[PDB]
Amino acid sequence: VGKYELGRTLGEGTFAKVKFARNVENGDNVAIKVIDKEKVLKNKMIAQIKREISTMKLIKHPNVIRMFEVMASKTKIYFVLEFVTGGELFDKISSNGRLKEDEARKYFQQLINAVDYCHSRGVYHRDLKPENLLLDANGALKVSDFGLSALPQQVREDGLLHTTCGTPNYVAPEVINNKGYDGAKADLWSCGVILFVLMAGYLPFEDSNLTSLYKKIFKAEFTCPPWFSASAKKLIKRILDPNPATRITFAEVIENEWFKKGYKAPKFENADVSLDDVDAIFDDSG
Amino acid sequence: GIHSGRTRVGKYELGRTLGEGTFAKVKFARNVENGDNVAIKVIDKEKVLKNKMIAQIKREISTMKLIKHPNVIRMFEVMASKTKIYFVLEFVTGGELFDKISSNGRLKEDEARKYFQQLINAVDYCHSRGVYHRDLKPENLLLDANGALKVSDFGLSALPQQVREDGLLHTTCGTPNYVAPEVINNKGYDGAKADLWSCGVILFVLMAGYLPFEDSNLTSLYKKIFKAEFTCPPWFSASAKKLIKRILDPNPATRITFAEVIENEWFKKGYKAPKFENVSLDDVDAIFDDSGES
Ligand SMILES: C[C@H](CCC(=O)NCCC[N+](C)(C)CCCS(=O)(=O)[O-])[C@H]1CC[C@H]2[C@@H]3[C@H](O)C[C@@H]4C[C@H](O)CC[C@]4(C)[C@H]3C[C@H](O)[C@]12C
Ligand SMILES: C[C@H](CCC(=O)NCCC[N+](C)(C)CCCS(=O)(=O)[O-])[C@H]1CC[C@H]2[C@@H]3[C@H](O)C[C@@H]4C[C@H](O)CC[C@]4(C)[C@H]3C[C@H](O)[C@]12C
Ligand SMILES: C[C@H](CCC(=O)NCCC[N+](C)(C)CCCS(=O)(=O)[O-])[C@H]1CC[C@H]2[C@@H]3[C@H](O)C[C@@H]4C[C@H](O)CC[C@]4(C)[C@H]3C[C@H](O)[C@]12C
């Protein structure tokens, strides 16, 4: 299909499937997702779906996985996604334990900047897990599934393995308990847990008793290990505020004492330019 | 030979810390007699002992210390100072079994059935000596160089999650996707049926390339599990489908048993039971007693 030469099938689900591919014009590893078109169009959120996908198509951030192309047929939608080869960020933990504070703060800086930027373009992840933190060959963080995470659950089951150690930890209490919730505050909770794990080497909420586990999460009862600095612990407790109404904002995190150390904000540009054929994103075109 | 600038417990010389949790650590170590490399888990003794399940913990760790199964991570020795317990465990270097799936997708029916056979034999073997895993997950399915499955954390999984946490994101996960609904419901009395369900989910992943129950929405995830709501991909043979539905039965009472799985026609294909010699020495009660070593 088009610019892309197909490789093996990575995953094959009921309403979606994923194939390996390369760009015959530049040599880039990509993946291509193919999903049932009417499954998306039927969905109640379609107007938001179209808007977020349209936006992500345009977004170029050095720490966000590129969505190169969105194409449709009469029955399918095709997403072409950047494929990186550095593996998962959490691989570093499984093999050498906790990261040093300065290395954890760096990846956190890249994550907070990428997430914040997507938010400022009106795109919220809402399902941020360690498996979305990828690395490129040069060890730069690449966050996946912005925009795609908006898709209905049945096309999110694309035949690939999605497994997370300690799933409930990454889900904010309001997302666990309520139908609706603030996207930015939910993503920030996930980011906060991700930082805890990077710096501690283990999850902040552990308990074999599920009732005790979820009680802990709803009161944000957890303990920072003794090697966390005073300033790192203060930031993590404001981020892992169980009330989304009082939880710190992204702007306040970016202005925080600890976060600013060694923080040189990334310099990049994008236009590309914005969204004037939005409702036709999934329109058939050979 | 020995290194004067390193600590030393028994014939083992301790090297550096791989992972650190609140109460447990994992260190590299070396058998100074024959040069074997091992991992040693070190845990606060008092924290282990102050637990109403300490009796079960001593039995399972005593059993595990004696079992030699080709598909189980070996526990060579257990030693104790006055304030620490040292669990001496074997290494593997073949990574995690779900690496194959994660980077390269599902496996063919023959090779997934092979891996399933190893899992089932290892788990059935441990069960029949009275050890139940109860936390089977991908982080416990390791491979060696021969690409043979080695199940980790038998015995150790009897320790409380927060005590055995070693800061490596392996031993303590608490991921509902692999947990039987009666366990989730705090009614998982039958340890063997609960382990079988996790084995069924693991098989499904090998043959499908993905989890049978999954959802970004936690409410929906738990509902799928309780109802055992899933579907097999169309490339599953009829018998495989039939076996997987018998395992992923949300009622443990009618769920198929381990013995029935072992005599199952689909399971039996290419199946070669592990030939190996099989005791009970000596003092279960003393498993954590001060060994009297540096
Ligand atoms: C899971 C793999 C990572 C490969 C890997 O595995 N690399 C490390 C090797 C080391 N091993 C694991 C072998 C040993 C470590 C043992 S351990 O088990 O501890 O890991 C990563 C690398 C590239 C990723 C895809 C692309 O972005 C495109 C696309 C973006 C969407 O948004 C989501 C879907 C999709 C298809 C992505 C899915 C997935 O996310 C991929 C396949
Ligand atoms: C906190 C939530 C609240 C329920 C809920 O669902 N709250 C509204 C959310 C709406 N949704 C997010 C579903 C969106 C719907 C959009 S829709 O498109 O569907 O319209 C509920 C739902 C499922 C509950 C757990 C399970 O019981 C399993 C388990 C039973 C044991 O005893 C121990 C306790 C435990 C861990 C429970 C904890 C907790 O109590 C959970 C997470
Ligand atoms: C995860 C790390 C190793 C990281 C690693 O080695 N990562 C794979 C990279 C290399 N690869 C395999 C990808 C190359 C393949 C090339 S190929 O071309 O073949 O694909 C491994 C190495 C040693 C392992 C521990 C010991 O067991 C002791 C102990 C046993 C008990 O029961 C409880 C668990 C515990 C703590 C174990 C946990 C974990 O399991 C450890 C830390």
- Residue A16 inside a domain? The answer is yes
Mutate to test the interface with A, among B137, B169, B204, B205 (most CBs of A within 10 A): B169
Last residue of a domain, one of B65, B91, B117: B91
- Residue A273 inside a domain? The answer is no
A79 C-beta neighbours (distance < 10 Å), count: 23
**In A201-244, which residue ranges form alpha helices assigned H by DSSP?**
210-219, 230-239
Given a contact cutoff of 8 angstroms between Cβ atoms, the answer to whether B137 and A61 are in contact is no
Given a contact cutoff of 8 angstroms between Cβ atoms, the answer to whether A192 and A171 are in contact is no
Q: Which listed ligand is nearest to A132 at the C-alpha?
A: 1
Strand partners, B8: B13
Given a contact cutoff of 8 angstroms between Cβ atoms, the answer to whether B23 and B47 are in contact is yes
For chain A, strand residue ranges (E) read 4-12, 16-23, 29-36, 67-72, 76-82, 133-135, 141-143
The kind and range of the H/E element at B141 are strand B141-143
Question: Any residues with CB less than 8 A from the CB of A47 and at least 6 apart, and which?
Answer: none
Distance CA(B131)–CA(B157), nearest Å, equals: 10
- Residue B45 inside a domain? The answer is yes
What is the CATH classification number for the domain harbouring A261? 1.10.510.10
Contact A153 B216 (CB under 8 A): yes
Task: Say which amino acid occupies A9.
Answer: T
> Both B108 and B233 in a single domain?
yes
The kind and range of the H/E element at B27 are strand B24-31
What is the CATH classification number for the domain harbouring B38? 3.30.200.20
> Both B38 and B79 in a single domain?
yes
How far lies A264's CA from each of A117, A250, A252, A267, in Å? Answer: 15, 16, 16, 9
Distance CA(B94)–CA(B148), nearest Å, equals: 8
Nearest to A161 among B20, B209, B216 (CB): B209
- Residue B198 inside a domain? The answer is yes
Please name the method used to determine this structure. X-ray
This PDB structure is determined at a resolution in Å of 2.3
Residue whose tokens read 């329109």: A283
- Residue B283 inside a domain? The answer is no
> Both B112 and B200 in a single domain?
yes
CB within 8 Å of chain A, chain B residues 46-65: none
Indicate the SS3 state at residue B143. Answer: strand
* Host domain of residue A51: 1-83
> Both A57 and A156 in a single domain?
no
> Both B5 and B64 in a single domain?
yes
User: What six digits make up the tokens of B73?
Assistant: 């991570």
> Apex CA B45: angle with CA B23 and CA B4, to 5°?
85
User: Ligand 3, closest atom to CA B93?
Assistant: 6
Give the total number of structural domains in chain B.
2
Distance CA(A134)–CA(A91), nearest Å, equals: 10
**In chain B, which residue ranges form alpha helices assigned H by DSSP?**
45-49, 54-64, 98-104, 109-128, 161-164, 181-184, 191-208, 218-227, 238-247, 258-262, 265-268
Contact B173 A161 (CB under 8 A): no
Binding-site residues, ligand 3, Cβ < 6 A:
A 94-95; B 26, 39, 41, 73, 89, 91-95, 142, 152-153, 156, 168, 170-171
> Both A140 and A201 in a single domain?
yes
Q: CA end-to-end span of chain B, whole Å?
A: 16
